[PDB]
Amino acid sequence: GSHMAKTVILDHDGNKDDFVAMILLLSNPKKVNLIGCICTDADCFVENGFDVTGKIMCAMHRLIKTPLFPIGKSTATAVNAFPTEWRFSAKNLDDMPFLNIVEDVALWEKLKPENEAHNGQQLLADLVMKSKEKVTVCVTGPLSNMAWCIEKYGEAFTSKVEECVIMGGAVDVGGNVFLPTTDGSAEWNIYWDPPAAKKVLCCPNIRCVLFSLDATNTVPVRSVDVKGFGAQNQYLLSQMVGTMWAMSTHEEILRDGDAYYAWDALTAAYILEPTIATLEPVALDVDVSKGKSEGRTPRAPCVHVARNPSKQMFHDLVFASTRVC
Amino acid sequence: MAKTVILDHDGNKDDFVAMILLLSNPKKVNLIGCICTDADCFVENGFDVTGKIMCAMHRLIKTPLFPIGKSTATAVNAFPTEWRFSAKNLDDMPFLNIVEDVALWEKLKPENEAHNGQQLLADLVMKSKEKVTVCVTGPLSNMAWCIEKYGEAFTSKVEECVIMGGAVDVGGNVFLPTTDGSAEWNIYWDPPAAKKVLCCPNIRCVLFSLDATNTVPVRSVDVKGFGAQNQYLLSQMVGTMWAMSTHEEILRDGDAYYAWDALTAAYILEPTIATLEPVALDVDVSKGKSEGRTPRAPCVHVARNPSKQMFHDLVFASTRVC
Ligand SMILES: [Ca+2]
Ligand SMILES: [Ca+2]
Ligand code: NI
Ligand code: NI
Ligand code: NI
Ligand code: NI
Ligand code: NI
Ligand code: NI
Ligand code: NI
Ligand code: NI
Ligand code: NI
Numbered sequence: 001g002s003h004m005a006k007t008v009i010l011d012h013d014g015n016k017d018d019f020v021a022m023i024l025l026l027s028n029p030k031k032v033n034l035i036g037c038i039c040t041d042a043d044c045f046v047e048n049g050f051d052v053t054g055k056i057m058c059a060m061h062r063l064i065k066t067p068l069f070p071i072g073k074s075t076a077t078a079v080n081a082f083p084t085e086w087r088f089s090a091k092n093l094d095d096m097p098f099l100n101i102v103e104d105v106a107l108w109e110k111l112k113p114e115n116e117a118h119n120g121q122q123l124l125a126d127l128v129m130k131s132k133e134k135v136t137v138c139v140t141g142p143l144s145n146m147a148w149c150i151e152k153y154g155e156a157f158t159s160k161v162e163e164c165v166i167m168g169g170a171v172d173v174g175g176n177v178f179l180p181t182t183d184g185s186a187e188w189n190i191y192w193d194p195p196a197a198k199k200v201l202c203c204p205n206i207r208c209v210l211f212s213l214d215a216t217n218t219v220p221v222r223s224v225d226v227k228g229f230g231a232q233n234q235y236l237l238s239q240m241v242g243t244m245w246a247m248s249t250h251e252e253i254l255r256d257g258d259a260y261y262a263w264d265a266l267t268a269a270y271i272l273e274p275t276i277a278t279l280e281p282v283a284l285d286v287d288v289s290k291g292k293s294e295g296r297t298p299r300a301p302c303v304h305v306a307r308n309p310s311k312q313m314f315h316d317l318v319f320a321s322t323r324v325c
Numbered sequence: 326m327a328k329t330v331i332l333d334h335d336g337n338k339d340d341f342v343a344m345i346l347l348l349s350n351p352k353k354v355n356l357i358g359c360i361c362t363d364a365d366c367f368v369e370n371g372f373d374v375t376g377k378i379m380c381a382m383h384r385l386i387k388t389p390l391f392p393i394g395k396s397t398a399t400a401v402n403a404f405p406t407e408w409r410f411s412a413k414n415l416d417d418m419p420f421l422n423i424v425e426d427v428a429l430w431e432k433l434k435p436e437n438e439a440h441n442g443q444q445l446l447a448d449l450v451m452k453s454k455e456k457v458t459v460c461v462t463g464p465l466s467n468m469a470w471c472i473e474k475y476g477e478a479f480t481s482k483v484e485e486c487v488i489m490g491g492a493v494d495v496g497g498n499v500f501l502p503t504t505d506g507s508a509e510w511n512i513y514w515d516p517p518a519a520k521k522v523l524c525c526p527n528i529r530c531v532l533f534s535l536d537a538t539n540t541v542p543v544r545s546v547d548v549k550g551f552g553a554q555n556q557y558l559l560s561q562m563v564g565t566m567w568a569m570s571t572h573e574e575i576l577r578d579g580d581a582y583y584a585w586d587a588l589t590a591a592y593i594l595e596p597t598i599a600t601l602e603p604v605a606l607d608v609d610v611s612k613g614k615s616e617g618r619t620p621r622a623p624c625v626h627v628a629r630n631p632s633k634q635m636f637h638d639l640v641f642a643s644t645r646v647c
Contacts, residue, residue: 243419
């Protein structure tokens with residue numbers, strides 16, 4: 001009645017925000033049974049994102065005895081690619097000392113070949129459809145893999161999904177896609193593959209919880225917060241998250257963003273504590289045109305848009321989770 | 326015996342690897358001060374990182390505390406702005422926010438704020454009982470100031486000056502619309518300062534130019550080696566810094582990240598790491614396309630042929646110290 005863990009799959013695209021989300025899920029086995037991860041070649045190069053996924057899985061397996069799980073590289077291709085400079089992060093993370101602990105390298109080298117054989121889209125479909133319990137899918141990259149599953153399997157897939165918790169969009173606030181060919185109204189995850197986003201968000205047979213910029217822009221990650229990880233440096237997960245957040249805040253200074261934001265980590269937070277935000281049912285359009293507003297998600301089935309997330313609850317959740325090991 | 330050393334640096338990842346190498350080897354090096362210049366960093370951030378590393382090593386291995394001074398030297402030609410934020414980033418890293426180190430630095434910072442960096446360099450060298458080796462990993466401005474103000478009263482107490490700078494027989498690395506690519510950054514930042522120091526017969530200069538440094542790349546396969554040593558704070562520090570460095574050269578399309586400043590400190594620890602060629606240099610101090618160039622023309626001693634294996638061994642041994 002409150003004592004069972006949720007069955008979860010992480011469908012991610014391999015950047016620092018995606019891995020904070022991953023750590024949040026995997027560090028909390030009382031609440032979350034992580035049965036698979038999918039990596040997409042969007043905010044990463046897929047080979048690097050795959051390797052970092054595998055190292056984190058192996059480290060947690062060693063330290064807290066969380067189960068191993070299948071990991072699959074999606075063959076989904078971009079409609080609009082992420083900026084090249086942004087996609088090298090997973091490569092950089094795979095050189096970090098906390099991801100090269102000798103036992104973790106040894107176990108991942110052993111498990112990598114069996115996971116190499118997986119097709120990411122098909123793995124998502126298979127894990128959901130064979131599962132005894134309904135599955136929560138946490139989507140922190142684009143919606144291409146979910147769209148593929150709906151297209152190929154329809155209700156045979158959707159009837160086994162509990163809900164889809166998604167990072168994407170911008171409803172009542174500005175977007176973050178700033179290119180010579182865009183108007184700044186779209187958000188990146190949607191812009192990467194707008195028709196996929198439309199297929200998923202408009203499907204009445206899947207419940208979508210949407211963390212758009214409306215919510216995620218209210219949870220900045222600042223220097224004063226990043227520096228809190230030093231007090232917990234004895235824990236591997238605090239080394240990892242501290243480092244990743246430090247790297248992220250630096251990126252936003254270099255890119256002249258107002259701030260770095262929790263972004264993807266909020267989807268995972270919601271799965272762990274669904275009172276962290278309130279939900280507004282909203283009908284959305286998804287702009288799939290080739291105009292300046294491609295990928296826009298303006299107000300127009302109801303999508304459930306996360307509103308007003310608790311900064312304090314998020315902070316408490318991240319700091320407790322990163323003391324797990 | 327230990328050599329008495331000062332580090333005159335400008336606050337980026339290569340400077341801090343050099344610092345770690347010096348400070349982790351008290352049997353060989355007595356580090357009596359550090360100077361930070363507002364060149365490849367913003368000086369306030371470079372100052373704070375210097376302090377935190379000092380405090381961490383004091384805590385872990387009981388190395389002495391020492392004065393740290395911010396130089397007020399100003400750039401002739403500033404480093405690219407986007408490169409200068411590294412020290413700020415490092416000061417957010419968890420290995421530099423261990424609570425005891427933060428606390429000790431908050432106590433010691435105000436006493437060091439009073440120091441003028443140029444004057445501190447002069448004062449430390451001139452009051453030292455032994456002759457001092459100055460390890461210069463940023464621009465030559467502070468050494469030039471000391472020579473200008475105090476002349477032989479200063480230089481007569483310098484054992485030798487070990488400097489990161491120049492490119493003699495190879496191309497440079499200063500790529501701007503107003504340059505030809507023949508000059509190296511440390512020299513370009515302040516060419517007249519470099520000319521004053523390199524051309525002074527009364528100071529013995531050991532010069533690590535791109536000729537030497539570009540033969541000692543830092544590659545992924547190497548950086549990953551720090552994982553085996555992650556229980557050591559210095560390995561978390563150097564591993565992370567080199568990971569960050571190799572990333573920067575990917576983004577910037579460099580052929581590789583290079584040891585750079587870390588080789589000067591390596592040389593102080595093991596002088597057989599490289600051979601030395603005596604060479605007369607010119608320093609181009611004009612405003613032309615070749616500003617800052619150090620072409621063959623007193624003899625400067627140019628490092629040649631540094632041992633990659635010795636360097637690797639030294640860095641890995643040093644980062645298992647704590
Ligand atoms: Ca993502
Ligand atoms: Ca330097
Ligand atoms: Ni229950
Ligand atoms: Ni992201
Ligand atoms: Ni399989
Ligand atoms: Ni707190
Ligand atoms: Ni440098
Ligand atoms: Ni003490
Ligand atoms: Ni003093
Ligand atoms: Ni490139
Ligand atoms: Ni080795």
